[PDB]
Amino acid sequence: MKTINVFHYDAFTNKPNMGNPAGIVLDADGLTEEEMQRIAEKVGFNETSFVLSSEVADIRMRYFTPGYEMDLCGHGTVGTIYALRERGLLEEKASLTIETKAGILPIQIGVNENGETFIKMRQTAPQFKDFAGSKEELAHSIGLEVNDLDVSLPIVYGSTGNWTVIVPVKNLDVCERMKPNNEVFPSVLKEIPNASIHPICLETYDEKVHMHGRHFSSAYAGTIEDPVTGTASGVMGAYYATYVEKDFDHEMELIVEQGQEIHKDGRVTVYVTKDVESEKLQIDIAGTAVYVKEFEVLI
Amino acid sequence: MKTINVFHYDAFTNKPNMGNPAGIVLDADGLTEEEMQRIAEKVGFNETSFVLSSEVADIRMRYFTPGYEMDLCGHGTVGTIYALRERGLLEEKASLTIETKAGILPIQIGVNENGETFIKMRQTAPQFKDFAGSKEELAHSIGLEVNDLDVSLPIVYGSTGNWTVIVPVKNLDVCERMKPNNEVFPSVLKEIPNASIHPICLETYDEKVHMHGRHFSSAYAGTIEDPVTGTASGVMGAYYATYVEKDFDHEMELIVEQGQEIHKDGRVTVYVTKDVESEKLQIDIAGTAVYVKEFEVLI
Numbered sequence: 001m002k003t004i005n006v007f008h009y010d011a012f013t014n015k016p017n018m019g020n021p022a023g024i025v026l027d028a029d030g031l032t033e034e035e036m037q038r039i040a041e042k043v044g045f046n047e048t049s050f051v052l053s054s055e056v057a058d059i060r061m062r063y064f065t066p067g068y069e070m071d072l073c074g075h076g077t078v079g080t081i082y083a084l085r086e087r088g089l090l091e092e093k094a095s096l097t098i099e100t101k102a103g104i105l106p107i108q109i110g111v112n113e114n115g116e117t118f119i120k121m122r123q124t125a126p127q128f129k130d131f132a133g134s135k136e137e138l139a140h141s142i143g144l145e146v147n148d149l150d151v152s153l154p155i156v157y158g159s160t161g162n163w164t165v166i167v168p169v170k171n172l173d174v175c176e177r178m179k180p181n182n183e184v185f186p187s188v189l190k191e192i193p194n195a196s197i198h199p200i201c202l203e204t205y206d207e208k209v210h211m212h213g214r215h216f217s218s219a220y221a222g223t224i225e226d227p228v229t230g231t232a233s234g235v236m237g238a239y240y241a242t243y244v245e246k247d248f249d250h251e252m253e254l255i256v257e258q259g260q261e262i263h264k265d266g267r268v269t270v271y272v273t274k275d276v277e278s279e280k281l282q283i284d285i286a287g288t289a290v291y292v293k294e295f296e297v298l299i
Numbered sequence: 300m301k302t303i304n305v306f307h308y309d310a311f312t313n314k315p316n317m318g319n320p321a322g323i324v325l326d327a328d329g330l331t332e333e334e335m336q337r338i339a340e341k342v343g344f345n346e347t348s349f350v351l352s353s354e355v356a357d358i359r360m361r362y363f364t365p366g367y368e369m370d371l372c373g374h375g376t377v378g379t380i381y382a383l384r385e386r387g388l389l390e391e392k393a394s395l396t397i398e399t400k401a402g403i404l405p406i407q408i409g410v411n412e413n414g415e416t417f418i419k420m421r422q423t424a425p426q427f428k429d430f431a432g433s434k435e436e437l438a439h440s441i442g443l444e445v446n447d448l449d450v451s452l453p454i455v456y457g458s459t460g461n462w463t464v465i466v467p468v469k470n471l472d473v474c475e476r477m478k479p480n481n482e483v484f485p486s487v488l489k490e491i492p493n494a495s496i497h498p499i500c501l502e503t504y505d506e507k508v509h510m511h512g513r514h515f516s517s518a519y520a521g522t523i524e525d526p527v528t529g530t531a532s533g534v535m536g537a538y539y540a541t542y543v544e545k546d547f548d549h550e551m552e553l554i555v556e557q558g559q560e561i562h563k564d565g566r567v568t569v570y571v572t573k574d575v576e577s578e579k580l581q582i583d584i585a586g587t588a589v590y591v592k593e594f595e596v597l598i
């Protein structure tokens with residue numbers, strides 16, 4: 001048997017246990033892909049990342065769920081680069097390239113006002129489609145009634161890499177009552193039956209934050225609810241810039257929060273940029289992260 | 300998008316192109332399994348080896364044929380360690396360990412009777428089974444008549460890691476007449492259909508060597524003839540100690556030659572020890588290697 005040290009960092013939070021868990025093997029150059037998959041299974045977190053040597057970038061990363069390899073994982077990238085940086089395991093520079101199976105990712109490493117290191121990455125340009133299904137059926141699928149929805153803002157499918165349904169609800173009291181019936185989502189979401197559902201409101205628990213959301217997994221995911229979701233956060237930023245606060249020049253940013261209803265406290269910073277030659281908004285997200293624990297896995 | 304330097308050293312010879320070609324990537328830590336497989340396919344050698352980081356041994360190695368990964372490769376290990384040492388990429392030591400998927404291999408290094416650097420490896424204790432099939436079909440499958448076989452020595456399946464059939468034939472003249480019909484081997488070798496066939500005789504081209512072999516690959520392999528075969532040579536040494544000369548004091552060494560019929564000239568040194576612990580023969584082999592070329596592979 002071999003002994004592998006695995007770290008647990010929580011992404012998109014500054015407090016242990018209050019974010020999206022990210023397993024990390026800080027130097028995976030001694031491992032095969034089969035070993036990586038087995039380590040991720042034994043770790044049993046939603047995802048475990050492996051830091052590797054690269055021929056074409058500063059580093060390479062592979063991302064695994066307990067059952068399969070993913071081409072990309074935003075929260076795993078945030079947690080992993082944060083850990084490398086904070087541990088003294090990176091070169092002295094404010095940007096990094098990461099070789100992945102989906103391409104080379106440029107990463108920016110910065111510090112926020114509070115002195116915390118933030119990891120910033122680009123998402124895919126946003127796409128929206130109107131939701132044309134039944135609002136009452138949608139409300140019921142998340143344990144609500146139709147008058148819990150916010151009539152003033154549109155329900156839309158949105159993607160900056162993965163499709164989710166942005167469902168505006170009246171306030172936090174509504175969010176607290178939600179109960180996802182994920183198995184029924186496909187019947188309600190005709191256009192994109194495998195989308196997740198991400199209800200939102202502008203009322204927030206955290207003071208510096210502009211939007212609140214909750215994330216309910218697709219019917220095809222197995223899971224019920226994700227703690228702090230970087231992909232959906234990017235969609236929320238694009239949505240905000242498109243439907244809520246449209247009047248900006250060049251660049252705006254907002255912070256979204258997630259996880260309070262399940263005893264967490266996640267925050268994602270979303271940067272929305274427009275350029276005169278670009279057909280769509282440009283979306284970046286950034287988050288900080290925090291050490292949770294380290295433990296041994298035998299393989 | 301990646302340019303990989305591939306080295307070619309011939310194993311089990313001191314003369315360029317007179318041994319068993321070993322493709323070598325000296326630092327493969329930037330590569331996936333798929334990339335390593337693709338490089339092996341492009342190179343086209345019977346085996347290409349990849350040097351990788353290890354947390355539990357001096358180095359780690361993976362071995363690939365043009366089509367699939369192998370668990371072990373003696374000639375690739377010899378060529379690779381010889382190359383690493385030649386280029387100063389290993390701590391210069393008389394012993395080291397190599398992590399492989401099949402286990403950690405202890406390796407010894409020294410200077411042989413001929414003044415060349417040897418790489419020495421432990422094989423598995425010999426297993427034998429009598430060949431009970433048709434000697435006629437066997438002889439024909441190697442382009443011989445049944446009369447060309449040496450009746451005074453037994454035909455056996457033998458393994459020190461890979462099953463092969465030791466087929467004693469008259470002499471070197473008979474060896475030169477041979478031509479393998481590998482496709483028919485499984486139908487001939489009823490007991491172990493996927494075995495290779497390794498004819499031998501005690502007449503040698505080099506008077507300072509003890510046994511002559513030739514290696515005809517299994518039907519399943521992507522080859523027809525292997526130039527200098529470490530596994531089979533270990534079986535030959537065991538065979539010598541078991542069936543030819545059983546009278547020695549604790550340990551003996553012999554040299555086997557292979558490759559002359561295809562215009563090469565390989566040598567494997569075989570160490571046979573009467574292990575008191577296992578109460579069975581213990582077999583090591585060693586050989587030298589030689590630089591042939593370097594070239595780039597784009598993947």
Ligand SMILES: [Mg+2]
Pocket residue numbers: 028029030031052327328329330351
């Ligand atoms: Mg590797």
